[PDB]
């Protein structure tokens, strides 16, 4: 049932969106971090600074240790937790329990953050990224088999509030216009094939395999849209081309006072529109993905404020392409694993002053654009 | 055409004031700022300060305790002074165009010697 | 004080080849994606003159030999090709903070 799901989650972009899970007997109440860049279940097993709460397994009377424990590695951290199985309920969606595995996590290092709300992750990617091995099987693998859901599920994210994830199928509801669908191109990470990307009407030039160059992936586990090195250099470069920045006078003297805004004055209209486009599932067509300033020129501040700071939501990455929590914030993204595809569409509540975020239009041509993008 | 001229003493005594005058040609100073850069030997290019359209001034706050800029809309003028002056004051002394988001019209620059 | 250090001090180019002169930040010069870093000419009793603004924007009336890229703390001038008119000091200068300061230069020395 997709309509008990709507807006099961909570949270931001930048510190993550998180769904509420009940794990163990009795039921010990803990928030997971929704992460499409990662395939296991793992939870905080012992206190830390930065999170409230743990799962305790002395005292779930249905745990079970499988007998090994787990590390993860990562750019700038890591965690390492035992192993067992243990009985969960998703009280927004799946009130019949069903067994998962569980990482309950240790010792870790750039994982609990300060500022965040959760404290554990569900990863939603492939088994293959699964540690120690692809034959831990996956949350979502469980839920598929136990609850006899089809292999699919989609997310909004309303922090452009919370979002909905949706396990088991389309929440019609979450949407208008037409879903466009891209392949995923190798079942591990979400990944799909970026053909161009766009600012203010404008393509990069670029040799598309820039994009794809390690990898182009969509992870609801990254905060920013992350460029590899020479993509964000092109990028910022038609940035500042198509941009129409005021000029240094009374009160503004330094290009830091440029973040700041008074008087409902935003800095929106000075800045461009950036699109993606992506192969359609019939090669010869592409559809693409776009993104307002609205989305990319992002507010900072707590409430109570008669002004606003904005952060630019684009950054370097060494690696992959990544299509973060800044740019799913503008759509409906549908993981249709049973499909080996990934789906956009327009989010209704990706709006600001009832005005549309982002983008979505199709067909183009692809005819200009080698075969295969990804190297 | 743009135009922007110092006028300076060319020489002045230690510890003594410094007063520079920029007239301006070719645009308004109620529209565009005016900076102040300095260039020596041995201290390279420096950002001075600025006096904008609207009168407000913004100044590099190495030097605030003894600079002052100011100016006269009427006359197109733009001026600077400096007390408390030292030998390695001794500099060629530019003023300069606001534009966009740095400084586009120099003067030719004024020759100051800080000497007795 | 973001402190500007420009690399090589000093560069000789053929007529005709390329120049790439360097300046280093010592913190990050960006705001809302843009570099508030700008390049200069200063040719032998001259005042130095702009030649790109926001690190990639160049000047209406400067030649399309001369170019500029970088972001963050790391940027470049290229002069290419290189005549004979190039020789002169070029300066970086940055005003993502106050006050606004500049580089120590880079000479570019025609090899005739």
């Known amino acids: 049932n997709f309509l008990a799901m709507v807006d099961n989650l909570q949270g931001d972009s930048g510190r993550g969106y998180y769904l509420e899970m009940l794990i163990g007997t009795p039921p010990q109440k803990l928030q997971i971090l929704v992460d499409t860049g990662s395939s296991n279940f793992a939870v905080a097993g012992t206190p830390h600074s930065y999170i409230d709460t743990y799962f305790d397994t002395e005292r779930s009377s249905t745990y079970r240790s499988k007998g090994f424990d787990v590390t993860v590695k990562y750019t700038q951290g890591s965690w390492t937790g035992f192993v067992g199985e243990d009985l969960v309920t998703i009280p927004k969606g799946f009130n019949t329990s069903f067994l998962v595995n569980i990482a309950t996590i240790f010792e870790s290092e750039n994982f609990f953050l300060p500022g965040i709300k959760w404290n554990g992750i569900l990863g939603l990617a492939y088994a293959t990224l699964a540690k120690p091995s692809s034959s831990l099987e996956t949350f979502f693998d469980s839920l598929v088999t136990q609850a006899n859901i089809p292999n699919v599920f989609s997310m909004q994210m309303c922090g452009a509030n919370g979002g909905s994830l949706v396990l088991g199928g389309i929440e019609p509801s979450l949407y208008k216009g037409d879903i466009w669908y891209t392949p995923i191109k190798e079942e591990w990470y979400y990944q799909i094939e970026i053909l161009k990307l766009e600012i203010g009407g404008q393509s990069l030039n670029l040799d598309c395999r820039e994009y794809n160059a390690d990898k182009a992936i969509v992870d609801s586990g990254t905060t920013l849209l992350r460029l590899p090195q020479k993509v964000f250099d092109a990028v910022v470069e038609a940035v500042a081309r198509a941009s129409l920045i005021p000029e240094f006078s009374d009160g503004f003297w330094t290009g830091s006072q440029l973040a700041c805004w008074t008087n409902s004055e935003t800095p929106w209209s000075y800045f461009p529109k950036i699109s993606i486009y992506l192969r359609d599932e019939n090669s010869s067509r592409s559809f693409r993905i776009t993104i307002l300033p609205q989305l990319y020129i992002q507010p900072m501040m707590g409430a109570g404020l008669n002004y606003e700071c904005y952060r630019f939501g684009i950054s370097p990455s060494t690696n992959a392409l990544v299509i973060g929590a800044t740019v799913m914030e503008g759509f409906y993204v549908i993981f249709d694993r049973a499909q080996k595809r990934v789906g956009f569409a327009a989010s209704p509540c990706a709006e600001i002053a009832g005005a549309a975020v982002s983008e979505i239009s199709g067909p183009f041509s692809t005819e200009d654009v080698a075969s295969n993008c990804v190297p | 055409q743009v135009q922007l001229k110092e006028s300076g003493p060319v020489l002045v005594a230690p510890s003594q004031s410094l007063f520079i005058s920029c007239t301006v040609s070719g645009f308004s100073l109620t529209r565009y700022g005016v900076h102040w850069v300095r260039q020596s030997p041995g201290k390279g290019l420096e950002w001075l300060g600025v006096?904008?359209?609207?009168?407000?001034?913004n100044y590099n706050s190495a030097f605030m305790s003894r600079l002052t800029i100011s100016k006269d809309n009427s006359k197109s003028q733009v001026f600077l002074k400096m007390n408390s002056l030292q030998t390695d004051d001794t500099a060629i002394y530019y003023c300069?165009?606001?534009?966009?988001?740095?400084?586009?019209?120099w003067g030719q620059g004024t020759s100051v010697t800080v000497s007795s | 004080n973001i402190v500007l250090s420009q690399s090589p001090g000093s560069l000789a180019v053929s007529l005709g080849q390329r120049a790439t002169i360097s300046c280093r930040a010592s913190?990050?010069?960006?705001?809302?994606?843009?570099?508030?870093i700008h390049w200069y000419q200063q040719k032998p009793g001259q005042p130095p003159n702009l030649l790109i603004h926001?690190?990639?924007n160049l000047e209406s009336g400067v030649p399309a030999r001369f170019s500029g890229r970088g972001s963050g703390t790391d940027f470049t001038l290229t002069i290419d090709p290189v005549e004979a008119d190039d020789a002169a000091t070029y300066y970086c200068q940055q005003n993502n903070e106050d006050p606004w300061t500049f580089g120590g230069g880079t000479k570019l020395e025609i090899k005739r």
């Open positions: 300069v165009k606001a534009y966009r988001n740095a400084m586009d019209y």
């Open positions: 913190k990050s010069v960006d705001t809302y994606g843009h570099s508030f």
């Open positions: 926001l690190a990639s």
């Open positions: 006096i904008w359209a609207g009168g407000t001034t």
